[PDB]
Design a protein around this nucleic acid. Structure first.
Ligand code: A1AC7
Ligand code: Q8Y
Length: 543
DNA sequence: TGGGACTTTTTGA
DNA sequence: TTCAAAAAGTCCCA
C-alpha cells in the first residue's frame, strides 16, 4: 500500500492542469491498482473537476448528458481504467467505486483481472499512474522469465527486475501528449542492469521530474529505496528535468501534510538537468558538484585504470575450510609455505591495514593427497561434500580441496593498495604484509612503467583526502543509507594528477603513515597533517 | 517484543 | 579456463 501523501502527489501531478472543457473524456489508467489507492483519489479529483465546470460543459456539449447526477456514470464508464492480477483486489475496488455514489440502470466499470504485461491493450490512455510491483523480484517461473526475455528484450535481460517491463508497457500504451506518473524502486537509475531501460525511457518520452528519496524508508517496514518518475509524450523542445534529491535520509514522511511541503523544504534540494545531455549512468548532480567534477576531470591527465592494474580477492567457495584463526592449533598441521595472511574489510583503515588475525590455507599449491593427507582429512575434509558441490568441482576443472577462485599469488604477494568494496568514505591502504583478501576487499598495484611517476604513498595521500572523497561520491553508486559501493568499474575511473605539489603531498602521506604505524598511538597530528595535504590538493586543482 | 544491518559464493560471460 | 558483478539469511538490543 503506497502512502497516501505519495498517491495524492502523483495524482495531482498527473491531473492538475487538465483542460476538462477541451477534453471531457480523459482515460486514466492504473496498471497495478490492488486495493485501488490511486483510483479512488483519481475518482475524487475527477468528480470535483467535473462538478466545478458542470455548467460550462452543459452549455458547450450536450445539455442533457452533462448533469451533476450523471457525473458518477460518466466517470465509471469513460474515465477510470484499472488492471490487476488479483481477483479479490479487483472486486474490492469495484465495490468501493460502486459505493462512491450510493441500481435503476446498468452500470459498467472498466476493470480488468489479467496480466498487464501479456494483455492486448485495445487503446492508449491520456493519463497513467501508479506503483509497479517489486515483491516478486527473482521468484518468476522459468517460463515467465523466458516470456519476459522474448517479449521485452529492449528492457529485460537476465538480471533485470520485473517492474522494468511495466515501464515499457506504460510508455507504449500512453497516448501522444499523455502523462505518466509512477513510484518505483530507484535502482534502475544507477544499476548496470537498467541501461537498456534508461535508454528506452530517454529516447521515447520526455521526463519532467525525478524525486529521488535515496535510502529514506518511504514504505514502512519495507527496505526499498523508492523514486517517483513523471513523464509526458508532448511536443516539447528543450525538455529540462526537475530533480528533487533528498538531503536528510532520516526524515519521516508522516510528519508532513503534503509532499510539496517536503520537496520545497530544506530536506530536499532541487536542480535542473538537460535531458539531451544524459549519459548512460544518469549522473544527477547540482551545478556546484558538476563544476567540481568537471574541474577535477580536466585537471587530471591520468586515471587509475591508465596507471594501475586492479583485481578482486580470493573466492574460496567455502571459507570455513581454508580460513583459520592465526592462533589455531590446526595451523601446526599446515606447512607455513601454504599459509598466507588473511584480512577482512574491517581490517582496512585509511593508509594502513591492521595486523592480520587470520590465515588462509592456499590449498592450490598442494600437489597430491598422499603427502598432505593430514591437512586434507583433519582440516579441509570436514567440508568435502560441500566442497564437492562447487560448480568447478562438479565440472572437473577444480579439484575438491582446492580454492574455487585462487587468483594469482604474485598479485597479492607484492606492495599494493587495498580498499573495501562497500564503505562510507574513501579507505585506501598500502599493504606491506602481502595480505590476501576475500571478495570484500579489492586491490590494485601500480603498473611497472608508472612506478617512477606515481608512488603508493602519493596515491593513498590524494585518494584518502576529502577532495577525492567528494570527487568519488559525486558519481558513486549509493547502495544503502550512508554506504557507497567501491567497485573497480567506478574506482578505476578516478582521475589522478601530478604537479609541483607532488613531493610535499607524498611527504605528508609518509608522515601520516609513519604516525599510524608506531607504537605510542594517538591520531592527533595526523588530522592536522591531513588538513595541510588537502590544501595542497585544492591548490593543485584550483578549487 | 518487535525490527534492519551486514558478508560469502553463485554465476554469466 | 578464469574474472568479476551481484545475489543471497541470520541474527540481538532497548
Ligand atoms: C544488525 C543485527 C545483526 C544481527 N545478527 C547477525 C549479524 C551478522 C553480521 N553483523 C554482525 C551485522 C551476521 C549474521 N548472520 C549470518 O548468517 C551472516 C554472517 C555473515 C554474513 C552474512 N551476510 C549475508 C548472508 C546472506 N545474505 C545476505 C544478504 C545481504 C547482506 C548480507 C547477507 C550473514 C547475523 N542481529 C541483529 N539483531 N541485528
Ligand atoms: O503492487 C502490486 C499489485 O499489482 C498486482 N500485480 C502484480 N503483477 C501484476 C501483473 N503482471 C505481472 C505478473 C507477474 C507474475 C508472474 C507470475 C506469478 C505471479 C506474478 N498484472 C497485473 N497486476 C499485477 C499484484 O497482485 C498487486 O495487487
Amino acid at each position: 500500500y503506497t502512502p497516501k501523501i505519495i498517491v495524492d502527489y502523483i495524482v495531482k501531478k498527473t491531473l492538475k492542469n487538465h483542460d476538462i472543457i477541451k477534453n471531457p473524456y480523459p482515460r486514466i489508467l492504473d496498471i497495478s491498482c490492488g486495493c485501488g489507492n490511486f483510483l479512488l483519489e483519481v475518482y475524487d479529483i475527477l468528480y470535483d473537476l467535473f462538478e466545478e465546470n458542470i455548467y460550462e460543459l452543459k452549455k458547450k456539449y450536450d445539455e442533457n448528458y452533462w448533469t451533476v447526477d450523471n457525473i458518477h456514470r460518466h466517470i465509471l464508464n469513460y474515465c477510470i481504467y484499472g488492471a490487476d492480477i488479483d481477483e479479490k483486489a479487483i472486486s474490492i475496488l469495484k465495490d468501493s467505486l460502486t459505493n462512491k455514489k450510493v441500481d435503476e440502470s446498468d452500470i459498467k466499470i472498466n476493470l480488468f483481472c489479467c496480466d498487464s504485461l501479456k494483455k492486448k491493450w485495445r487503446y492508449k490512455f491520456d493519463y497513467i499512474v501508479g506503483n509497479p510491483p517489486y515483491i516478486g523480484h527473482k521468484k518468476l517461473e522459468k517460463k515467465y522469465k523466458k516470456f519476459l526475455l522474448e517479449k521485452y528484450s529492449e528492457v529485460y535481460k537476465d538480471k533485470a527486475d520485473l517492474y522494468f517491463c511495466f515501464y515499457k508497457k506504460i510508455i507504449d500504451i500512453l497516448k501522444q501528449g499523455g502523462i505518466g506518473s509512477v513510484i518505483t524502486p530507484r535502482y534502475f537509475l544507477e544499476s548496470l542492469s537498467g541501461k537498456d531501460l534508461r535508454e528506452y525511457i530517454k529516447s521515447n518520452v520526455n521526463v519532467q521530474e525525478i524525486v529521488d528519496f535515496l535510502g529514506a524508508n518511504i514504505f514502512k517496514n519495507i527496505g526499498v529505496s523508492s523514486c517517483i518518475l513523471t513523464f509526458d509524450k508532448k511536443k516539447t523542445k528543450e525538455t529540462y528535468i526537475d530533480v528533487f534529491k533528498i538531503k536528510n535520509e532520516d526524515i519521516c514522511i508522516n510528519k508532513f501534510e503534503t509532499l510539496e511541503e517536503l520537496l520545497k523544504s530544506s530536506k530536499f534540494e532541487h536542480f535542473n538537468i538537460n535531458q539531451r545531455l544524459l549519459s548512460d549512468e544518469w549522473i544527477l548532480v547540482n551545478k556546484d558538484d558538476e563544476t567540481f567534477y568537471n574541474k577535477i576531470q580536466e585537471k587530471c591527465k591520468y586515471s587509475l585504470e591508465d596507471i594501475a592494474i586492479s583485481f578482486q580477492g580470493i573466492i574460496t567457495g567455502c571459507d570455513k575450510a581454508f580460513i583459520l584463526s592465526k592462533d589455531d592449533v590446526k595451523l601446526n598441521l599446515v606447512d607455513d609455505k601454504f599459509l598466507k595472511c588473511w584480512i577482512k574489510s574491517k581490517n582496512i583503515n585509511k593508509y594502513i591495514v591492521d595486523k592480520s588475525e587470520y590465515r588462509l590455507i592456499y590449498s592450490n599449491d598442494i600437489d597430491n593427497e598422499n603427502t598432505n593427507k593430514r591437512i586434507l582429512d583433519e582440516i579441509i575434509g570436514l567440508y568435502k561434500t560441500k566442497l564437492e558441490n562447487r560448480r568447478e568441482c562438479k565440472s572437473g576443472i577444480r579439484k575438491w580441496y582446492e580454492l574455487q577462485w585462487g587468483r594469482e599469488k604474485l598479485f597479492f604477494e607484492r606492495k599494493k593498495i587495498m580498499y573495501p568494496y562497500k564503505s562510507n568514505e574513501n579507505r585506501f591502504a598500502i599493504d606491506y604484509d602481502n595480505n590476501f583478501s576475500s571478495a570484500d576487499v579489492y586491490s590494485f598495484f601500480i603498473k611497472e612503467e608508472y612506478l617512477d611517476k606515481f608512488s603508493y604513498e602519493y596515491l593513498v595521500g590524494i585518494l584518502n583526502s576529502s577532495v577525492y572523497d567528494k570527487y568519488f561520491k559525486i558519481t558513486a553508486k549509493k547502495m544503502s543509507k550512508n554506504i557507497y559501493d567501491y567497485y573497480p568499474n567506478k574506482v578505476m575511473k578516478i582521475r589522478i594528477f601530478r604537479d609541483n605539489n607532488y613531493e610535499e603531498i607524498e611527504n605528508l602521506s609518509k608522515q601520516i603513515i609513519s604516525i599510524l604505524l608506531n607504537k605510542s598511538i594517538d591520531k592527533g597530528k595526523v588530522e592536522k597533517l591531513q588538513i595541510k595535504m588537502d590544501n595542497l590538493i585544492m591548490d593543485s586543482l584550483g578549487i
